[PDB]
Design a protein around this ligand. Structure first.
Ligand SMILES: *[C@@H]1O[C@H](CO)[C@@H](O[C@@H]2O[C@H](CO)[C@@H](O[C@@H]3O[C@H](CO[C@H]4O[C@H](CO)[C@@H](O)[C@H](O)[C@@H]4O)[C@@H](O)[C@H](O[C@H]4O[C@H](CO)[C@@H](O)[C@H](O)[C@@H]4O)[C@@H]3O)[C@H](O)[C@H]2NC(C)=O)[C@H](O)[C@H]1NC(C)=O
Ligand SMILES: *[C@@H]1O[C@H](CO)[C@@H](O[C@@H]2O[C@H](CO)[C@@H](O)[C@H](O)[C@H]2NC(C)=O)[C@H](O)[C@H]1NC(C)=O
Ligand SMILES: *[C@@H]1O[C@H](CO)[C@@H](O[C@@H]2O[C@H](CO)[C@@H](O)[C@H](O)[C@H]2NC(C)=O)[C@H](O)[C@H]1NC(C)=O
Ligand SMILES: *[C@@H]1O[C@H](CO)[C@@H](O[C@@H]2O[C@H](CO)[C@@H](O)[C@H](O)[C@H]2NC(C)=O)[C@H](O)[C@H]1NC(C)=O
Ligand SMILES: *[C@@H]1O[C@H](CO)[C@@H](O[C@@H]2O[C@H](CO)[C@@H](O)[C@H](O)[C@H]2NC(C)=O)[C@H](O)[C@H]1NC(C)=O
Ligand SMILES: *[C@@H]1O[C@H](CO)[C@@H](O[C@@H]2O[C@H](CO)[C@@H](O)[C@H](O)[C@H]2NC(C)=O)[C@H](O)[C@H]1NC(C)=O
Ligand SMILES: *[C@@H]1O[C@H](CO)[C@@H](O[C@@H]2O[C@H](CO)[C@@H](O)[C@H](O)[C@H]2NC(C)=O)[C@H](O)[C@H]1NC(C)=O
Ligand SMILES: *[C@@H]1O[C@H](CO)[C@@H](O[C@@H]2O[C@H](CO)[C@@H](O)[C@H](O)[C@H]2NC(C)=O)[C@H](O)[C@H]1NC(C)=O
Ligand SMILES: *[C@@H]1O[C@H](CO)[C@@H](O[C@@H]2O[C@H](CO)[C@@H](O)[C@H](O)[C@H]2NC(C)=O)[C@H](O)[C@H]1NC(C)=O
Ligand SMILES: *[C@@H]1O[C@H](CO)[C@@H](O)[C@H](O)[C@H]1NC(C)=O
Ligand SMILES: *[C@@H]1O[C@H](CO)[C@@H](O)[C@H](O)[C@H]1NC(C)=O
Ligand SMILES: *[C@@H]1O[C@H](CO)[C@@H](O)[C@H](O)[C@H]1NC(C)=O
Ligand SMILES: *[C@@H]1O[C@H](CO)[C@@H](O)[C@H](O)[C@H]1NC(C)=O
Ligand SMILES: *[C@@H]1O[C@H](CO)[C@@H](O)[C@H](O)[C@H]1NC(C)=O
Lengths: 123, 439, 440, 120, 122, 443
């Protein structure tokens, strides 16, 4: 059950099982304009995240495995430590620095994969 | 060994400044412009979430300030302008029914004002409070004629506060601090998530905070920096103090057409004895309340120190007195009866004299002045004191005595007394972590 | 053994209330240049097996049309001259130069001290007024708006002639149109089609007699929210138009006075020729056929042994008791007692309706926002079609065999609703589910 | 061809063959601006929901949720080809918040299972 | 490393390797001016995404379909399309047959979805 | 054999017209505080092997800049005092006190009855006005009294141009033409893509374009149709010509309250002697500048023609005189001293200078509109400004079919032509990322 941010503070493992709750809440006088600005902003943020999932090859998925190997330099923790003894807020702070590196790699991998699919289909 | 895995819908967030919109259950707060609220709002307790709050750096306060001012101004746009009232007034003293306390407070002013037809004039007289009229050299003018224009407030639009709920845009959330005895800053071990705040009444006052929330257990002393003499102290009480205010005079209100479709409202006469406006605070309740305040101040200023309360040191009427809107009338009450005591380690009452003004400047601006129409009859209102705004004198540093005086006048500090437990955050649903899963 | 299958793009809908926008064909008071240019070839899709329920009395398109018209009307006056300097004592005598005894007391010759472009100078002005605009203040008169409203002059360059506008639904919405001939507005409509925009509708403003609208497909249609309840108005749609010819049979000379730095006032200076009363002509034969058709259709609701009687309005504001309309820019208030004075029991000879004219206009039944209509230069004539009537009924006659109908009106939403009766707005709901044999 | 809502009133079996006809007509002074924003918001709510259910790229999507006779106890031959979509939508409107909940639950379980199989 | 539209002018077979460069930048008095501009960027983004959805290319930058190429639209050797033309030139040549190709694409995907549904039912 | 393949993210575009928004480098009449702060280090992308066609005479960016400037201008006057109490009969006499010979009849000493804080009172006011603002009815009225209400500009709001950057919305891009010696109206072999334009200062002037961009190599002559004498010619210089303008009279500014919180500013008096406003350019620089201009005009009017410059002639002051804002004051300078020469193929080109006399006005009617007017408050003290002449607007006399002599005169009055001198290198295009091509790949 819980609620919109109800899993926050739970460990990453447990929190990964409630992903649709947050997914559902996204998108749901000058004071008419204030409301439009709020609506437009919610839409643009939603779409930028969707654009990245599209580019990285995940699209309409909540859990997306990819072909980019994990670097021990981003984090050298054991999996049990990450999934059982940490929350997502703690994790996000720990690897905040490496976010753009990882995102760039996710994009490169997908570009390579789409080209390879095209060539194999032509054969 | 491990691969990057992407997760969407991750319950993580980062501090953010965004635009909030209002929601609600004529009236100057224009509540018809707000989104109707959810009759049964949700609140989600977040187990094991500790978050850091800072009420002194809170954009929600800045937005409430701007919305309140904008609503105020919007409500005056369609109302009658009183520029025809900057004429020489011929004023004499009202003496017929004056008690000693009221000598010099009212003036009987005659003047030449326009009619619907622009080629005619009418002779009008009305009663004015001394504070609204300034001598020119019996020749007087209204106090605003050399700095601003007057707009008459519309007689049918109420000033009574209606609770306003602030709501976050989708993609954002408001975190609430549930801790009891929370001083406005630092970590808050018990939090919850809401989409909208509780309703907040936009009560406007200058020294005492009226009709707000009470502390759950103890008086709470909040300040950006306690030892900084430049900062105000917001004191939240754990019990209300009841205050009974009145305008005992029975006013007869008259009106005059001054132009096509326009009319001016004024006090014609007073029926009965003329007495001063005043507020009543019970002795016993006030003494207990103040005692609780000094106990908490000692925690900050020393176990064996002297705490002295004193009246405001000076400044504009708006800061030296306690201002409020009672029945739609504007009162300026003297609080020296409440803050005149040195603290060292039945049915009696304190009467606070009050003055009344009809020409009101507000939000500390110049050039925009309002005329508050008089109200017919006798005015009475009862309200609760839920907090205080105090300012501390700089000390000698070599003497164990501190002096506190009523402070205030900066409206954002009143807002902060309700918007201290709320923080706005942006939800960041997209993130990554390693796992043994390859595409 | 069946599974849920999700389908997207499913042709279903729900009743909905949304914002419609204005479109127009590629000055005026309808901001027709602000409206979205129209589609030269609009589509209409017939729905072969769809029966839909319409209710014209609950149609929110009417409320929007009402608000859009008022808003646009007010916007057109924002930049115009504010004639506050006219609210002075006027010295007035009768215009007696040419009296036919129809116009006796209808025009006054007034003089006053008007402002000039310089703050320190005044000018004496002589102008004519049409009586209804001027009231005594004890030869001393004032304009009627002096004790309620600032008066704004309409801009002379902006026309009040109705221009068809189209209402268009936003993406995700559609407008369903009822094609069922002889449809009374409340109930199932066996033949419907989908359009994105309405037909062009002219925002013609009038009372009692509805001008320049749509005609009934085959027969007069009697439409009402409730026939039995006599408090409701009856909207009658005519099958054939009745031609009405209206005139202002006077040659008016219009003058212009500078009253401020960038402001000027327009007024009638004098009248050339004789002075005659404004009037409208309706052919008797056409009108007699028209009522016979209306009576026949009323008997279908009131009884074949019921006598239908027509009578003039019982009273009220001039704006209600007369036929209000605008021709050539002038505002007319015509007396219709010549049209509704007969009892119905189971060639070039016209009916002349006398008319009054006003320059100070208070529209949309509001108080506090008066408009001054500049006089129009020359002689004015217009021809228009009566395409429907508004009737009310006298109640309390629980034991009588005769019903009485009167030409009531004044609520503008009734005119709007007479064009927007065949349309409803629906929200498209493309997502849905159904059982199939297909399983992921 | 038929047109934008031309299949309304046709039986479900025929109407299901024109889905692109309605899909292409979705998403196609400030009153107009507010209306434009709403069109986008409605479009996105439906797409968001299809995404959650695992139907993000499809007009026709088959799931793993079984049909309950308590929602509607009918032969397929009297649903398909003997009923229109408007009629069907009214018949089961009571149950759409149940069905939607089940579709969401099914996808969450499915994604976790896919992740575990890839891991093995 | 090229920036936005940096590959313009390069041949089609070179430019096709920068599809994310031009993808990332899509969707990335004055009160209304600015608000309308933001709404417009969103509307254009969504129309393109909608077509990719309908055509069955919703998750891809490069998408292969089952619609054959007509020599009547353009009769060229692949080597003189991919190595000797830029995308701007290509667009100018195939512009007059695009609303033919786009229409086929929608029909093909709709037929494919129906076939998938029937096969799953078996 | 081949199959349709769909690609998204394709680097192509179409010409398009969209709404642009402003950005600025983070008080004034441009409300620049309301613009989006700019990127301190924006990126320009060079496009190799892209030739595009630009047309500066058919470029909406000019129209938007024009509308934005007018709108902002009007907004800046919304909170300012309306001087309607001022439209009165004035009693005026000549200022003859310490006047030089040119300043004869230029200033009038006007007495009038003005309103005050109370409606019952009046005050007598004595102020000096320029002769161009006042018309005879000793009785005079202000020039705007029979056409418009006049608004006093707010003393706290600056008229000094601030660079404004125009930025395209996402999905759009601005192409820039980098070609040197580009006249507009042609193919541009060297282009690049930007998201925002360089900052453009909205400098307002008539005959001579001040503080703009310079040509990099040669003077460039640009026109919509060079053989059509009804068109204007814009000339972009490759070196600036410096011009020094001054208002030498030392003004004392006084103010009065005319109502409930409103006040009027006026020149009270002049402390020293009264002299004519003027602008200087050096002779040598101006003479070399024209030689460079003539040399390029000969590319369109060749075969050894005679190129004659002459003064502008017409009734309108904005058109015939060089109009500009110098320190908040409004100047109208006579340029006949700059455009009075004849050049032949046999002529060619220390501390000498050309002095242009100037007139000053306080009642300004901008953007060629009728019905609005602004009163420019006087400025206390002495005004001096130094500006760069970066270009010219010229017109050509027609009627010559039978002559070898062409005559050019200063032109101006249409503000869009000033904008065009900065925006000539920019074009707005829409990005069209979706497209198809044949490949051997089948699904
Ligand atoms: C073409 O480009 C040139 C160069 O940018 C423009 O010339 C400048 O114009 C501005 C605006 O008039 C000038 O700015 C003003 O300078 C006055 C003099 O200040 C001098 O002394 C101080 C020290 O006391 C020095 O710091 C300063 O640098 C100068 O040497 C100031 O007094 C003015 O301030 C007053 O007015 C403003 C409102 O305008 C108020 O906000 C202030 O509070 C104050 O009351 C102001 O700063 C600038 O000096 C000029 N530069 C040069 C080199 O002359 C041309 O105008 C432009 N041409 C056109 C047509 O636009
Ligand atoms: C908040 O933290 C507590 C303490 O770790 C969590 O409670 C534990 O939950 C696990 C799994 O069900 C049990 O095996 C432990 O015995 C519980 N501990 C205690 C002391 O009871 C709790 O679940 C966390 N809350 C959230 C929302 O994650
Ligand atoms: C509110 O309580 C917090 C502690 O919960 C006080 O913060 C501490 O202040 C001291 C003195 O500056 C610092 O040395 C500590 O490091 C601070 N701790 C934390 C967690 O921030 C704060 O000063 C109190 N404020 C008031 C008005 O009482
Ligand atoms: C909180 O207030 C104290 C004052 O009581 C600040 O301390 C002073 O800081 C200034 C420098 O800005 C020094 O010159 C003074 O000598 C300090 N006063 C004392 C008594 O030590 C303190 O810095 C403030 N806290 C914060 C975070 O700004
Ligand atoms: C318009 O026509 C409808 C028939 O389509 C009339 O509706 C019927 O009214 C009676 C009396 O209230 C009800 O008993 C019937 O059940 C209604 N039928 C349907 C199909 O709804 C309606 O009264 C007519 N209105 C007018 C003004 O003629
Ligand atoms: C249509 O109008 C009739 C006439 O008023 C309504 O019928 C009356 O209803 C009241 C109760 O509200 C009874 O006391 C009257 O005796 C009824 N009058 C007659 C003549 O029957 C009728 O209800 C209205 N229809 C609707 C749908 O509101
Ligand atoms: C509207 O309904 C009618 C039936 O009432 C449909 O007509 C049938 O169409 C099928 C098509 O396969 C034919 O085989 C039948 O013979 C037709 N019936 C009759 C009696 O002729 C009609 O097609 C429907 N219209 C739409 C758009 O669905
Ligand atoms: C523009 O096109 C020319 C084509 O002549 C390019 O010049 C050739 O570039 C290729 C590399 O792309 C070299 O291998 C050739 O040797 C170059 N010359 C010839 C004769 O082809 C030029 O590089 C292109 N400009 C760009 C896009 O940078
Ligand atoms: C600016 O440069 C362009 C490009 O060279 C010139 O365009 C030519 O104009 C003539 C006369 O109209 C045409 O016959 C040519 O075909 C055009 N050439 C091209 C490539 O389009 C233009 O005339 C120049 N402008 C000026 C004022 O000199
Ligand atoms: C009127 O009141 C003032 C005090 O405000 C006092 O000084 C003055 O003497 C009084 N005048 C009369 C006539 O009572
Ligand atoms: C003027 O008109 C009134 C009626 O409005 C009439 O009673 C009066 O006698 C008329 N005066 C003259 C001179 O005709
Ligand atoms: C494309 O269509 C246009 C317009 O019908 C036509 O003029 C042109 O010849 C067509 N073909 C090509 C190759 O441009
Ligand atoms: C003012 O000066 C002008 C210009 O020299 C002259 O024509 C006019 O007569 C003078 N007026 C007076 C009153 O001196
Ligand atoms: C120009 O100079 C040359 C060389 O001195 C001379 O021959 C020629 O006649 C001159 N032309 C004119 C027009 O003076």
């Amino acid at each position: 059950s819980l609620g919109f941010l109800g899993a926050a503070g739970s460990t990453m493992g447990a929190a990964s099982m409630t992903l649709t709750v947050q997914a559902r809440n996204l998108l749901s006088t000058h004071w008419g304009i204030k409301q439009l600005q709020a609506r437009v902003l919610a839409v643009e943020h939603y779409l930028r995240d969707q654009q990245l999932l599209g580019i990285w090859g995940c699209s309409g998925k909540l859990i997306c495995c990819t072909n980019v190997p994990w670097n021990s330099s981003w984090s050298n923790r054991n999996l049990s430590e990450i999934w059982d003894n940490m929350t997502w807020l703690q994790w996000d702070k720990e690897i905040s620095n490496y976010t753009q590196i990882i995102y760039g790699l996710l994009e490169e991998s997908q570009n390579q994969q789409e080209k390879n699919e095209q060539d194999l289909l032509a054969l | 060994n491990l691969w990057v895995t992407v997760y969407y819908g991750v319950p993580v967030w980062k501090d953010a400044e965004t635009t909030l919109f209002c929601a609600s259950d004529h009236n100057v707060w224009a509540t018809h412009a707000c989104v109707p609220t959810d009759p049964n709002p949700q609140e989600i307790h977040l187990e094991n979430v500790t978050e850091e709050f800072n009420m002194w750096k809170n954009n929600m306060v800045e937005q409430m300030h701007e919305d309140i001012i904008s609503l105020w101004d919007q409500s005056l746009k369609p109302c009658v302008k009183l520029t025809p009232l900057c004429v020489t007034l011929q004023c004499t003293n009202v003496t017929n029914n004056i008690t000693d306390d009221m000598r010099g407070e009212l003036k009987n002013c005659s003047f030449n004002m326009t009619t619907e037809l622009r080629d005619k004039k009418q002779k009008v007289y009305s009663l004015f409070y001394r504070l609204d009229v300034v001598q020119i050299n019996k020749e007087y003018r209204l106090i605003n004629c050399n700095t601003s224009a007057i707009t008459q407030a519309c007689p049918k639009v109420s000033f009574e506060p209606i609770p306003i709920h602030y709501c976050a845009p989708a993609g954002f959330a408001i975190l609430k601090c549930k801790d009891k005895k929370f001083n406005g800053t630092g970590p808050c071990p018990s939090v919850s998530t809401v989409q909208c705040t509780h309703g907040i009444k936009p009560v406007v006052s200058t020294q005492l905070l009226l009709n707000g929330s009470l502390a759950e257990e103890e008086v709470i002393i909040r300040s950006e920096n306690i030892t900084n003499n430049a900062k105000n102290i917001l004191v939240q009480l754990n019990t209300p103090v009841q205050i009974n205010c009145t305008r005992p005079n029975n006013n007869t209100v008259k009106s005059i057409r001054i132009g096509p479709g326009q009319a001016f409202y004024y006090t014609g006469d007073i029926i009965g004895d003329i007495r001063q406006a005043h507020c009543n605070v019970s002795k016993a309740t006030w003494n207990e309340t103040l005692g609780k305040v000094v106990k908490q101040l000692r925690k900050h200023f020393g176990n064996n120190t002297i705490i002295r309360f004193a009246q405001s040191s000076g400044g504009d009427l708006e800061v030296t007195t306690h201002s409020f809107n009672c029945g739609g009338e504007f009162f300026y009450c003297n609080t020296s009866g409440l803050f005149n005591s040195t603290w060292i380690s039945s049915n009696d009452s304190i009467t606070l004299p009050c003055r009344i003004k009809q020409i009101i400047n507000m939000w500390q601006r110049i050039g925009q002045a309002m005329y508050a129409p008089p109200i017919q009859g006798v005015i009475r209102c009862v309200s609760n004191i839920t907090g205080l705004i105090l300012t501390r004198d700089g000390g000698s540093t070599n003497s164990t005595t501190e002096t506190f005086r009523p402070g205030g006048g900066d409206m954002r500090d009143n807002w902060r007394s309700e918007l201290y437990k709320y923080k706005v955050v942006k939800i960041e649903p997209l993130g990554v972590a390693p796992t043994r899963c390859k595409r």
